[PDB]
Ligand SMILES: CC(C)CCC[C@@H](C)[C@H]1CC[C@H]2[C@@H]3CC=C4C[C@@H](O)CC[C@]4(C)[C@H]3CC[C@]12C
């Protein structure tokens with residue numbers, strides 16, 4: 001609408017504004033009230049197929065042009081227009097209703113008279129909206145105040161950038177210290193926010209409070225921002241709205257909704273142009289035959305109007321009803337429940353997808369992490385062997401009051417239970433207060449919260465074996481044992497996990513003994529040299545990683561009361577430095593990071609969704625290349641790629657390093673080129689450089705890959721990847737996602753599928769097809785797409801064949817029977833009127849199937865045939881053209897040569913022969929017979945016999961009730977259809993499908 005400018009947002013009072021802000025509404029609609037009709041009309045009549053009808057109809061306005069009745073040109077086109085408008089309108093009402101659930105969420109705001117309850121749509125910039133726990137943040141906000149005593153909160157941004165880690169967000173310091181939540185309305189404070197941009201992980205702002213005698217100014221960053229679409233993980237937060245509606249950071253990354261057309265529709269449109277060009281060519285030949293006879297422009301276009309039915313409106317009507325039937329079938333399948341079809345005009349696109357691009361967090365995975373393996377070197381403990389770890393812990397803490405394997409197991413478990421950054425949170429269950437449960441350490445009211453879900457999984461696992469961690473402070477940590485006694489540990493040093501070191505350490509003192517213990521856990525690559533000599537770390541960690549687990553190496557070092565003093569004195573000496581602090585403390589910690597005894601290796605798995613591995617294997621077996629485009633980190637993405645068998649166990653993986661320029665990109669691209677049959681894992685930062693500088697080479701190397709993993713992808717980068725896959729290959733692409741970061745690539749893709757997320761519905765609402773589970777994709781692609789594509793191709797080709805046969809024989813009639821007469825047009829309106837009796841058996845091809853639904857799924861290789869364009873091609877169309885020409889020529893020439901008396905004794909023969917030939921041809925193309933096709937074929941014959949009976953009494957047509965009629969009809973019906981019967985049977989025999 002307007003240029004982006006920084007905004008001064010006053011806390012409360014949503015009226016001190018200079019620019020009007022958009023309403024906070026998420027809209028997936030295509031058109032508004034005003035632009036609905038023009039948009040639909042243009043999107044319909046922008047193609048040759050639909051514009052042909054308009055060109056035909058408009059000509060009826062020139063008096064020297066008029067041919068036929070006026071109501072025959074506009075009633076069918078009017079029906080087509082009215083069905084298209086109705087379909088689009090109903091789609092719009094359904095989209096608006098589906099958007100209402102998100103746009104009508106209930107929240108609360110702070111007013112001078114007290115809190116009041118308002119909806120999500122009415123949220124204005126500058127409003128103080130209260131967001132509770134496990135509630136989606138409605139609009140972009142600034143963290144002001146939280147009800148938690150530690151002055152912070154955790155955010156789940158899985159629906160914003162697809163990252164599984166929880167984001168720790170800190171409130172505004174000035175607003176946090178106010179005595180009550182009602183105090184922010186009596187302070188003259190404002191937030192100066194940057195212009196709404198597409199970046200989601202950055203924010204530059206400033207908080208200013210003018211009320212205080214010393215003005216207080218805070219510099220705001222991403223750590224104070226609660227973007228829309230995120231979920232508050234803990235506590236009740238209060239924020240000030242900065243952006244609304246389109247201005248939301250989620251919406252800037254969302255493209256405008258577009259109307260999609262399938263490739264099958266484009267091929268049919270090209271066939272219509274070919275037909276019209278052939279008509280024009282024969283027109284130029286026919287006029288040039290007479291060496292120009294004056295007013296040629298009149299006669300040639302009059303003859304065009306005479307053959308105007310070579311492109312039938314029945315084609316468009318049949319395709320529309322077939323697509324409606326396909327959508328009705330998809331919405332009613334019980335083996336893929338919950339499937340929703342939004343774009344009901346492209347069900348045939350599911351049958352020609354060559355590339356599938358999917359999100360990891362929430363689509364492939366369940367967004368749940370649990371502990372899988374505890375490897376102690378000499379023995380591993382799986383999910384079925386945890387009762388021995390529990391037994392060892394119980395035995396030790398029973399023998400405490402009443403080396404060995406139990407001691408080693410306990411030492412390995414306690415290190416996991418202490419070397420972490422997880423803090424318990426206690427809530428009031430309703431009977432016991434929050435302060436009531438803390439002093440007794442209630443199990444039902446205790447929740448573990450941390451930035452890394454792996455640490456939460458480890459803590460929850462140690463809870464299961466007996467060592468329950470019940471409290472944690474900045475200098476203390478309590479563990480609860482099976483003997484119900486509590487051990488008190490004092491946290492003397494903590495080294496938080498960093499993505500560069502890839503390790504986390506801690507130093508604790510056991511108050512019962514006083515011994516100093518140093519714990520360190522991290523990746524195997526960094527802990528290979530820290531731990532002492534061993535012979536199983538590099539092998540067992542590699543095996544556990546190859547199984548798809550997140551391996552960690554846990555180590556120990558017992559510190560005496562003398563090795564700690566010199567370490568503390570040097571650590572603080574490094575800390576109170578004014579020159580190169582980081583490298584100073586790094587050396588102090590590294591000096592302690594020596595000769596650590598190895599305890600155990602841990603395996604934590606991100607729980608996939610149901611039937612993800614079989615679905616990926618099914619899609620791989622059908623020639624579909626599956627790329628995982630995720631916004632998560634490299635390690636989690638690789639672990640999920642290995643877990644889901646997106647890469648085979650023996651497959652080699654090349655990790656794309658961090659490249660920053662053109663020269664650095666040449667070397668890495670070439671080095672990857674020297675590899676063979678190796679999957680590619682690339683970060684977003686390297687992808688940006690490769691796509692900016694090496695657009696051709698990167699994709700010519702990535703399309704040959706068995707699979708491609710691209711982590712930390714911005715939504716624009718995902719959409720760009722989809723766009724290049726569409727452009728440089730020319731093959732259809734499918735995009736699967738569950739969050740708001742997948743909407744861009746879902747809309748960009750030729751067929752976008754949106755998995756309904758657990759905490760968000762944007763991808764579901766903005767996709768052509770919405771599924772509840774990832775495993776439904778296999779059926780949706782192998783059955784509901786293949787059947788729709790095949791049925792649409794068959795019915796379109798049969799309709800074209802019928803019209804071509806009618807036109808060919810009716811051209812023979814007008815040429816070799818009279819060559820000039822008014823009574824020609826009475827016959828030249830009726831022998832093309834047969835399509836009232838054969839219309840039902842033509843609308844019975846939407847019930848046809850080549851193989852059973854359980855056979856396409858069990859043999860996905862049938863899809864590789866559709867990937868080649870078999871159902872509709874130039875060879876099949878040419879064969880149908882030859883068949884139609886042969887049938888028309890045979891019917892008319894045989895009718896004329898066998899017997900020739902006058903017009904009304906040949907019209908009857910030709911009409912019945914054409915109807916019977918078309919019915920037989922309908923019966924010819926069927927592969928598996930359905931009873932509705934049988935009833936349609938029988939009802940057609942019954943109606944034709946009824947018509948030939950009623951007219952017999954009124955019109956003297958006694959020719960029908962003779963023997964000379966029967967053999968004359970049945971010889972043409974035998975020489976027109978049955979030669980193709982023989983050909984089809986011999987095709988079955990010699991070349992089975
Ligand atoms: C008079 C003609 C042109 C039209 C009406 C007859 C048609 C609809 C009839 C005649 C013979 C019939 C077939 C005869 C036998 C079987 C085997 C069984 O699995 C049921 C379907 C199937 C395959 C029938 C399908 C319908 C069928 C093809």
Ligand SMILES: [Mg+2]
Pocket residue numbers: 158159162359360361362363737738739
């Ligand atoms: Mg996701």
